Each structure stands twice: as structure tokens, then as C-alpha cells.
């Protein structure tokens, strides 16, 4: 019931508005944008290209951070450097993710995700402590003057054994 016969018809007439503060850095603002959205993602995390900002990711094989790097356009889409860096002081195993990538035509009320596609992203076994890694993430498809987010999810180890859990 909220849909109301509302006008925008500029009547001359004086109305003072509050305070509005002041701008702000385009990064800064791609930064407040990935965050906000970070919060607002239940499947993986945000890294948008423009914030290009480290995001924190609790996966599988263990807390694990990561961020886009030199962002260049490809023959089909665009490569940029995908890097696992360690929250934890331990090395991180072989493991495969899924990375979805896209545009952002909306707004932070309300944003719908467009022209969104995946990837799988497999980094080396990390046995090295503290873990950190670099992979090339070569996106297909979409040009990085048009990238609009990059989400990191879907996180799981490959052909590597357990341990018995020996509860009985």
C-alpha cells in the first residue's frame, strides 16, 4: 500500500534539508560498498574489482583470505591475480573454489546481480607456514572496464585422506 500518487512537481517554494556531510574517495566508496555487500552475501564473499580489498572466507580446510591484483583484460574475458593469503598461522591444503563474477546494475537497498558466471579456481597444497598463495584467475566473457563483482565461494579440498574420527 505504499504505492501513492507521489509528485516531484518543483514548486518555488524554500524547504532547508539536513546537514549532508561531505564526499568521498571513489576507492573508499567501492571499499564501504564491498563491505556492506559482504555482510549482505550468504555464499562466499564479495571482491569487487574496484574495491580490489582482502575479504575473509571460514572454508573447509580453514580461515583463508583473498583479494584481486593486477585486474588486465583478456582475449575472451579478463585475468587478475587471485590471491589465498592465511588468517590462520598454519599451511592450508590442495583445494578447488568456485568464483562467480558479474555486474552490479542496482544499488545497495536493492542490487541485482547480472551477466554472473563461474569459475573454479584450484591453488597448490600450501605446504609452507604461514600459508599464502597467487593463482591467475582468467575470467571468460566479461571485460574489466565492465566488471562489476567478483565472489569467492564454494571452497573444497581435493583428492587428500582424513583422519579416522574414533569416537567409539
Given at each position: ?52 580489498t582482502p ?66 579456481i584450484n ?46
Amino acid at each position: 500500500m505504499v504505492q501513492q500518487s507521489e509528485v516531484r512537481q518543483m514548486k518555488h517554494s524554500v524547504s532547508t534539508l539536513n546537514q549532508e556531510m561531505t564526499q568521498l574517495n571513489q576507492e573508499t566508496v567501492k571499499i564501504t560498498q564491498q563491505n556492506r555487500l559482504n555482510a549482505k552475501s550468504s555464499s562466499g564473499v564479495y571482491l569487487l574489482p574496484g574495491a580490489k580489498t582482502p575479504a575473509r572466507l571460514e572454508s573447509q580446510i580453514g580461515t583463508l583470505r583473498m583479494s584481486l591484483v593486477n585486474i588486465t583484460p583478456d582475449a575472451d574475458g579478463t585475468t587478475l591475480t587471485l590471491r589465498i593469503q592465511g588468517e590462520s598461522n598454519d599451511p592450508l591444503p590442495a583445494f578447488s573454489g568456485t568464483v562467480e563474477y558479474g555486474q552490479i546494475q542496482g544499488t545497495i537497498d536493492n542490487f541485482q546481480e547480472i551477466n554472473v558466471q563461474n569459475q573454479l579456481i584450484n591453488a597448490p597444497a600450501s605446504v609452507l607456514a604461514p600459508s599464502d598463495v597467487d593463482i591467475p584467475l582468467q575470467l571468460k566473457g566479461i571485460s574489466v572496464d565492465q566488471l562489476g563483482f567478483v565472489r569467492i565461494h564454494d571452497i573444497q579440498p581435493v583428492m587428500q585422506l582424513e583422519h579416522h574420527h574414533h569416537h567409539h
